[PDB]
């Protein structure tokens, strides 16, 4: 079977198991990929989305330590355009409307958030074992 | 130039980039590895470390989205031993007194701590948006 490229962003603040198992989904969405992971602006994220604690350098060197991922860009666009897809040859954005043209071109392949997996969450198990009382 | 099997062994509770860069740095101990990492037991480490935020399964589970980890061992031993080390074929451990025997043998490796990049090294940051007065 041919090789498969696959596009996945996101801002990966505190990176967790949440993310990795999106990333890993993302690259077995094929028998042969290459998973092309993007990296979003600290500008963009803090103006568009909310807060980030990690600054992109952050971000990024923590991921290249992930098996799943093959390339990364980062910076990564904010939006992503058919442009941008035809300069790195991806085959599908793999995300979790504003992709309706991904699913109109067929280049749209869902993956799936894992709830209670988060940096948070360890943060509030951490604090439980202080009774209010 | 030969396979050589390497043995790091730790906690990985809350898993971050300091993990990861030692996990790194003892994959590259030599240009062909495998390298085994051990998790310590949930029991063992509350009684003779400290305490430990993530169950067993998932710190385990963490490590294996990591791409310089090629075995794990879950739960590994508190103590190595030299019987440990002839079972799983291991010819170097790679760590950061206990480890005597394993330097008279020639089969110690130093792998280096990153201050600063811990997961609640980043807590301290997000609580720093928040002025005292």
Same mark, same amino acid.
């Given at each position: 079977s041919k090789n498969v490229v696959?596009?996945?962003?996101? $801002?990966?603040?505190?990176?967790?198991?949440?993310?990795?198992?999106?990333?890993?989904? @993302?690259?077995?969405?094929?028998?042969?990929t290459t998973l092309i992971v993007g990296v979003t602006s600290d500008n963009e994220t803090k103006l568009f989305?909310?807060?980030? $604690?990690?600054?992109?350098?952050? &971000?990024?060197?923590?991921?290249?330590?992930?098996r799943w991922v093959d390339e990364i860009i980062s910076p990564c666009p904010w939006? $992503?355009?058919?442009?941008?897809?035809?300069?790195?040859?991806?085959?599908? $954005?793999?995300?979790?409307?504003?992709? @309706?043209?991904?699913? &109109? @071109?067929?280049?749209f392949k869902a993956t799936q958030r894992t709830e209670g997996v988060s940096t948070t969450d360890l943060i509030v198990r951490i604090l439980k074992n202080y009774e209010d009382y």
């Open positions: 696959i596009y996945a962003d996101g $801002v990966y603040d505190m990176l967790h198991l949440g993310h990795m198992k999106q990333l890993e989904q @993302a690259k077995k969405l094929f028998e042969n989305k909310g807060q980030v $604690v990690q600054t992109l350098e952050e &971000r990024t060197e923590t991921l290249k330590h992930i939006v $992503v355009t058919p442009e941008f897809l035809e300069k790195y040859k991806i085959d599908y $954005v793999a995300h979790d409307d504003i992709y @309706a043209w991904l699913k &109109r @071109a067929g280049k």
